[PDB]
Amino acid sequence: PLSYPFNEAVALDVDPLYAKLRAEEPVVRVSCPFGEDAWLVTSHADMKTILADPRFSRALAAEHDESRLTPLPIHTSILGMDSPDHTRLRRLLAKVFTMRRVELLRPRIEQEADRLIDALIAEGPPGDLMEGFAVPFAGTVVCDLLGVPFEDREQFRGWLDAFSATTVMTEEEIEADTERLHGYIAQLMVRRRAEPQDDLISAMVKASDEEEKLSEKELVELASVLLIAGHETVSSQLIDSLHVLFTHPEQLRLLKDRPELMPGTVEELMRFVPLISHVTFARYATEDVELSGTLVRAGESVLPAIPSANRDESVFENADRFDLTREHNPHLGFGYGIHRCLGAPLARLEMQVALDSLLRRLPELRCAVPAESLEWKDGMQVRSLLELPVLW
Numbered sequence: 001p002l003s004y005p006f007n008e009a010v011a012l013d014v015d016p017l018y019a020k021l022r023a024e025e026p027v028v029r030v031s032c033p034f035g036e037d038a039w040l041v042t043s044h045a046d047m048k049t050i051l052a053d054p055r056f057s058r059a060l061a062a063e064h065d066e067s068r069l070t071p072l073p074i075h076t077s078i079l080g081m082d083s084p085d086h087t088r089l090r091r092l093l094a095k096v097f098t099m100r101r102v103e104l105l106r107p108r109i110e111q112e113a114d115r116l117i118d119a120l121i122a123e124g125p126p127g128d129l130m131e132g133f134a135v136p137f138a139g140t141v142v143c144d145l146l147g148v149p150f151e152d153r154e155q156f157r158g159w160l161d162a163f164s165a166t167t168v169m170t171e172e173e174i175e176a177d178t179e180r181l182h183g184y185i186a187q188l189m190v191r192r193r194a195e196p197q198d199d200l201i202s203a204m205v206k207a208s209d210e211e212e213k214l215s216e217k218e219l220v221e222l223a224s225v226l227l228i229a230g231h232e233t234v235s236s237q238l239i240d241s242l243h244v245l246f247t248h249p250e251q252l253r254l255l256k257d258r259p260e261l262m263p264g265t266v267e268e269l270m271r272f273v274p275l276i277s278h279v280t281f282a283r284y285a286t287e288d289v290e291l292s293g294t295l296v297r298a299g300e301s302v303l304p305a306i307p308s309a310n311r312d313e314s315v316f317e318n319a320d321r322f323d324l325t326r327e328h329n330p331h332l333g334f335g336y337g338i339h340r341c342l343g344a345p346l347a348r349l350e351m352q353v354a355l356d357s358l359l360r361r362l363p364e365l366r367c368a369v370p371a372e373s374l375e376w377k378d379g380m381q382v383r384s385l386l387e388l389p390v391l392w
């Protein structure tokens with residue numbers, strides 16, 4: 001069995017093996033850094049099957065030593081459940097995390113992007129689009145929506161890596177930091193139960209309390225994943241997307257000249273950015289299933305290599321090319337099926353507002369160093385820059 005990951009992720013380079021596997025052996029047995037051996041799945045079509053077909057279970061991972069890249073299984077809350085418990089949380093969350101609520105955030109989101117650019121200009125070039133834009137932009141937006149005080153970021157930001165770290169933290173540190181975040185949210189919940197605000201933690205507590213829909217621990221773990229997705233995943237995708245744009249200047253000039261391309265541009269960035277470093281969370285087969293010629297037996301695990309699916313030449317013409325005009329884009333960057341991203345409307349709003357604001361306010365935006373000089377954050381389940389120095 002091949003040792004997986006084959007190679008540590010470098011910048012946004014995709015490992016050439018995936019294209020070889022997609023063409024010659026789309027499903028391959030691997031050993032994982034932790035837990036049971038698994039079947040790596042590489043193709044778009046098989047990705048949809050393992051993500052959405054009910055013969056594949058997230059909740060069954062709990063009955064295994066879960067195939068994974070993290071030292072401990074992650075507390076993935078709703079993303080670790082099947083029906084019926086998944087339906088229960090999906091419904092509570094959908095009911096409070098509505099499209100209307102998100103769209104009504106637009107003036108505040110736009111204002112926050114303007115305020116961050118104001119500070120960049122006041123402080124003078126070069127600016128860091130990571131710590132000086134993407135991080136505080138995503139942070140203030142999710143903190144506002146969830147109800148986690150952004151002023152507490154100095155306390156909680158240090159615990160988030162525990163939910164994502166592969167090689168760089170010990171079990172003992174992951175457990176400790178996981179406890180710290182869970183316990184921080186639980187304290188917040190006591191305040192929000194007694195003193196509701198216009199935020200998701202308050203709405204969730206109210207819905208759960210008035211229907212006894214969820215246990216306190218379920219509410220804690222669910223709010224925690226929402227904080228992580230809003231804070232870490234959004235800022236990672238955003239900074240990575242800025243790198244793609246700077247490293248494909250011709251597409252950047254096009255976007256600046258044709259701002260009506262933004263919605264398709266954000267979708268192409270979702271596809272093209274290999275955001276997930278390797279795979280998302282493993283599923284287990286409840287019965288035998290054949291995938292691209294390989295028999296996956298009942299009780300065996302599958303690793304969904306979503307970024308490789310988004311480079312599937314059989315689904316996207318010139319899948320190795322970044323083209324923000326791309327019309328056919330059934331990308332899986334927001335997942336697919338039962339666990340597909342509930343945050344996608346919010347993430348698309350943020351991506352669009354952030355990119356449009358920077359290009360409208362900073363027409364001459366360009367990366368201030370060569371790509372070779374950039375420092376990436378290694379040992380995590382998503383890729384991100386640590387700094388993106390820019391000029392304007």
Ligand code: HEM
Nearest residue numbers: 078079229230233234237280281333334335339341343347
């Ligand atoms: C660019 C930013 C984001 C990306 C790329 C992203 C991507 C994804 C992907 C690929 C999945 C499915 C994972 C799998 O099936 O293994 C997912 C699920 C999910 N995402 Fe996101 N996400 C983003 C932002 C957000 C935000 C802002 C929120 C909420 C504040 C959020 C909440 C969730 C939840 C709750 C799920 C699980 C849904 C379920 O199990 O039913 N995400 N996301």
